[PDB]
Structures are given as structure tokens and as C-alpha cells.
Design a protein around this ligand. Structure first.
Ligand code: PQ6
Ligand code: PQ6
Ligand code: CL
Lengths: 305, 301
């Protein structure tokens, strides 16, 4: 019993974290095989960030301008190239701790673990969701750039996020490991804002199933709804539309608890229109949306890595 | 910016998790140097659990009755002993991945990361606090026994908890790494219940300071309180008493934000009286109590 916000075990990723320094700028890099990946803004000074020409700033750097430290060992940079907003530093040593990995681009609503790092040293691990507005509500201080987000699917680490920036509202923006930003963001010190966010409906439903599995049933009711009527309610409350794909994905949880997906939608509709009336669900007074249906099944079944 | 429930990176502990089997029972063990630590109830069958005589059950076991698996490698058990509710299995191989470590017994209100494991394999990592009633609100299924709680301030892992049991309310009980239970619990299936739980006041205050550091001030007020009046109000909402030690521990956060501890206590009293009125504090509609003053300083600017 119990239901916690749980991250994947971070060990496989910890063995890949390195410190990357270029001039006065120091941030984190991800060392996989013979390449160290890091935000391309490591080559910028604060003035360069106002309007950077990354190709022009990079052509002025030699391999020796990049200092890569893995633990207490200095790696030798033997090449440097840019792919979108990520800088790739070829090093003379393949990381002996390189796990089985892949680079995956995730969709809004998908969750991942973040290994927050400073000076190439892991400091903490937390579970995030990619918001519908493409930001993450992370916890990052100055020096955290280059920290990565990941999932584990069997024994393979799927890297899905690299941290680049903090927006004025305190939320975060980054890229996939191919350097493509999530969201309409750019790696420049210019006015940028997170758009209006919405709640991840399929994740709220998954978390309501987790509550039922854990013995919290007060919010259940005799009613059901149509998918179209539920979406009319969900739109009114700044909830993401629930698709038939979402309904299908919730099938196993629906069969396990005996509550059809549209039966759980009727519970959620009532919660949106009436609130919780002083009650909590899994120790929360808000509807949690940072657990996917897969996270709920994984946590409730004890899948290991 | 941002404030998240954050666990320590678990890698150092993942490299210590092993599977321990004794007969039909399988659980997790912690392999440090040449010793594997695990709950002594690994020697019990389900029928032994009501009134086990662990000394008598253990004397009947030899080293070869304990099967320890580390990855796909079977370790050789060359000795065994019991220390309180923990079984210590001496093995013929020192763990090459043994981090710098120590065993620490924590007090209620302290937080720690839990690496939940099954069959010696890590499944997830989460953040917990030792409740005032000496339970932890974990997430543990059957087979999770022997999973550990820890902190990693610097590169030294301080192991503070080993999981042993789930109580009827769904909360968890365990021991320190010397096998002493937290709380009045015993490793028997006899009727046991968690005592009434209370909120960790010093942690709620630390988290209100985290909210002020992150730019939120809506809950502040022009009032202060005496420590005694604060405690008289706090106890009515099932909050733990705030001691002068707690006030002293909050000193650095108080100096950083410019809000005296008793001034923050007045804000907490008002929040307890009024609720949040549709507002949130650090993305929460409830007062959070699983961040210590030390956690807030470590995480915040
Ligand atoms: N260092 C790069 C920087 C940043 O946001 N970094 C940070 C990243 N995450 C948390 C932060 C907390 C406080 C301070 C900076 C943070 C600086 C500001 O302007 C920019 C502009 C664009 C980009 Cl792609 C990055 C950045
Ligand atoms: N297997 C040992 C057991 C237990 O609580 N295990 C578990 C531990 N944590 C989560 C659990 C979730 C579901 C099922 C069992 C759980 C069995 C029940 O009676 C007892 C009694 C005492 C002790 Cl020290 C352990 C135990
Ligand atoms: Cl302590």
C-alpha cells in the first residue's frame, strides 16, 4: 500500500553526468559512449545570450576551450559540433558506465525523472510531467543547465529532456537530446513566457484509479457520462480533452478496479463542479496530474530496473 | 526557482541491493563491504510470524540456508548473526560498489529517500519522513522488505531505515540499520496499530519559509505570537508542539527571509483557522510537512 511520487532509480544516469566548462560558464553534460552532450549556450557569456549567433561563437572555440570533468578525471575533447540547441563534444574515452540508452522525444502529459545536477554532480532526483504548455515545473537553480530527464523501459534508459532555461514564472524549458526545444522557446535572453497551462486529464483519471486501488473510494458515484459530454466539461475547467486513445490506455485500470473509464469521468466531473468538500484523495486536496496510467500500473505492480 | 519533493540520487544505494532467500522467503538485502543486512523475518514462514522465537529459528540455520544473489551472481554466505531485528550475513566478497557510508538513527520529522526494491532490484525512489508516530507513509508492496531509506549529504550515504512491515492502515514500520525498530513496533504479526498521527510543525514552518524564498507572501500577516500560545493553537489541529530547538533550527531561514520564527508561527495559526481560500502555496492546497529546515536550505536559493 501507499502511493508516492516516485522517480526511476537514477544510478544509470548518475554514471553519465559530467561537468562542462567553457570560459567562465560551467554547466552539466551527459557523457554517453565518446560524446558529451550539453546545452549549446555553454559557449555564451551573458551579453552573447542577448542575441547569440551560435555558429559564429562556436567557430572561435578550439577543443581545448572545453574542459570536461568526469569525477576527478579530466576528459580530452577531440571534436565539437552542434545539433540544434545541443553541443556535442567528442571525447577520447568512451564512458565505461554507458548504459543501454536511446533518445526519445516525449509528448505533453508524459512523465519522466529529472536528475538535478550542479558541477557535474547529481544533487537530487524528482519526477516531472511535460506540461501541456511544454514547460516543466522543475526545481532548478543556477548551474543546473544540462541536467537530464529520463525514463527506464526494461533495462534501457530513454533520455527525453535536457535542461536549458528558467522562465519568469519559475517554470522550466529545455530540449530533447537532439536539441529540439519542447515548446515555443528559444535559447536567448529575450522576453519569453509560459503559455496558459491545462490539466492532464488522462493522468488525473489514472491517479483516481491509484486512489481506488489504495482504498480511497469516497469520490465514486453511480453515474457514467459520454466522452463528448465529459470533454464539454473538461474544456470548461481548463482540462485537456480526453481521447479514445486515453480511454483505451486506462482499460487495464478500469478492469482491475471495476470502474469504467467513463464511470471515473463522471467522478471527475463531479469533483470539478463541486470540489472535494473538505476531503482529500491520496493525501492531496488538488487533483494530481503528474502520474500517467503506466506510472500507476508500474507502481501498483512493483516493476524493477 | 521551483520547489519539488526531491529524493537523493539512488545510484550509491542501487549498487548495494541484493536478493536474500531463506527457504521459501525472498526479500531484499543491503550489501556493504562483506556483510549483507536484511530483516531477520527472512527466516520465518508465514506460520512463524505470530510469535517467532528468532534465536531458536536462527540456531537451526546454517550459512548454506541463505542464498544471496547480487545481479546474476550468487554470493557465498560464510557467517551469520542477528543484531536486534536485523540479520547480518557475512559473505566471501566485499561489495566493490560499497560507497562511503554510515548508519544513523533518525528522529521523527526527519526526511529520507527510499529506494523501493523487489527481488534485489530497484523499482523506484521517493522521499519520506519519519512520522511523529514512528511510521512512514511509504509505497511498498509484498516483497519490498529490506528496502532502505537514506540520505546522502556530500558523497557519504547515511542509511537510516530498513523496511520490515506494513500496518493495517497502510503505513509502514521498520528499523534503523542496527535493527532497532522506530516506534513501539515488533516484527510479529500480532495486532499492532499506528498511534494517532500529527503534523510536523517545524517542517510546515520550513516549507512556509521555502514559499517566501520562492516569492510567495500572501499568507503572511502583521501578527506575531508567543511560543506557548502558538502551541496551544497548534495542538488543536493535531500539530506537533514546536520547541525552542525548532525555533533555533529555523533561525537561518528566518534571517534569510526577514520573517521572525514567531511571526511565521502567526501566519501558520491563521492558515489553520482560514484554510487557503482557493489559493495554493508552492503548488499545494495542503500544508506540506515532509520538508525539513535542512531540506529547504539545501533545495532553495
Ligand atoms: N544560465 C542560462 C539562463 C537560465 O535560464 N538558466 C537557469 C536554468 N535553470 C534555472 C535557473 C535559475 C536561476 C538562474 C538561471 C537559471 C540564464 C538566463 O537567461 C537564459 C536565457 C536563455 C537560456 Cl536557454 C538560458 C538562460
Ligand atoms: N512480509 C512480511 C509482513 C509485511 O508486513 N510485509 C509487507 C511489507 N511492506 C508492505 C506490504 C504490503 C502488502 C503485504 C505485505 C507487506 C507480512 C505480514 O505480517 C508481518 C508482520 C511483521 C513483519 Cl516485521 C512483517 C510482516
Ligand atoms: Cl534526525
Amino acid at each position: 500500500s501507499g502511493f508516492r511520487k516516485m522517480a526511476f532509480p537514477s544510478g544509470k544516469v548518475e554514471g553519465c553526468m559530467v561537468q562542462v566548462t567553457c570560459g567562465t560558464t560551467t554547466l552539466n553534460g551527459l557523457w554517453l559512449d565518446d560524446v558529451v552532450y550539453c546545452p549549446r549556450h555553454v559557449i555564451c557569456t551573458s551579453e552573447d545570450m542577448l542575441n547569440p549567433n551560435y555558429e559564429d561563437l562556436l567557430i572561435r572555440k578550439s577543443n581545448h576551450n572545453f574542459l570536461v570533468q568526469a569525477g576527478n578525471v579530466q576528459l580530452r575533447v577531440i571534436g565539437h559540433s552542434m545539433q540544434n540547441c545541443v553541443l556535442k563534444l567528442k571525447v577520447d574515452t568512451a564512458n565505461p558506465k554507458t548504459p543501454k540508452y536511446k533518445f526519445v522525444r516525449i509528448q505533453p502529459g508524459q512523465t519522466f525523472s529529472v536528475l538535478a545536477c550542479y558541477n557535474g554532480s547529481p544533487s537530487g532526483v524528482y519526477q516531472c510531467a511535460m506540461r501541456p504548455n511544454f514547460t516543466i515545473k522543475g526545481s532548478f537553480l543556477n548551474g543546473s543547465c544540462g541536467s537530464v530527464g529520463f525514463n527506464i523501459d526494461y533495462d534501457c534508459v530513454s533520455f527525453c529532456y535536457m535542461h536549458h532555461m528558467e522562465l519568469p514564472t519559475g517554470v522550466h524549458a529545455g530540449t530533447d537530446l537532439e536539441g529540439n526545444f519542447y515548446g515555443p522557446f528559444v535559447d536567448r535572453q529575450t522576453a519569453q513566457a509560459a503559455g496558459t497551462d491545462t490539466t492532464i486529464t488522462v493522468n488525473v483519471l489514472a491517479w483516481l484509479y491509484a486512489a481506488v486501488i489504495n482504498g480511497d473510494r469516497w469520490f465514486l458515484n453511480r453515474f457514467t457520462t459520454t466522452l463528448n459530454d465529459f470533454n464539454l466539461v473538461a474544456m470548461k475547467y481548463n482540462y485537456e480533452p480526453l481521447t479514445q486513445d486515453h480511454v483505451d490506455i486506462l482499460g487495464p485500470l478500469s478492469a482491475q478496479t471495476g470502474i469504467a473509464v467513463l464511470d471515473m469521468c463522471a467522478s471527475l466531473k463531479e469533483l470539478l463542479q463541486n470540489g472535494m468538500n473538505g476531503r482529500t484523495i491520496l493525501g492531496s486536496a488538488l487533483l494530481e496530474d503528474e502520474f500517467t496510467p503506466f506510472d500507476v500500473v508500474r507502481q501498483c505492480s512493483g516493476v524493477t530496473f
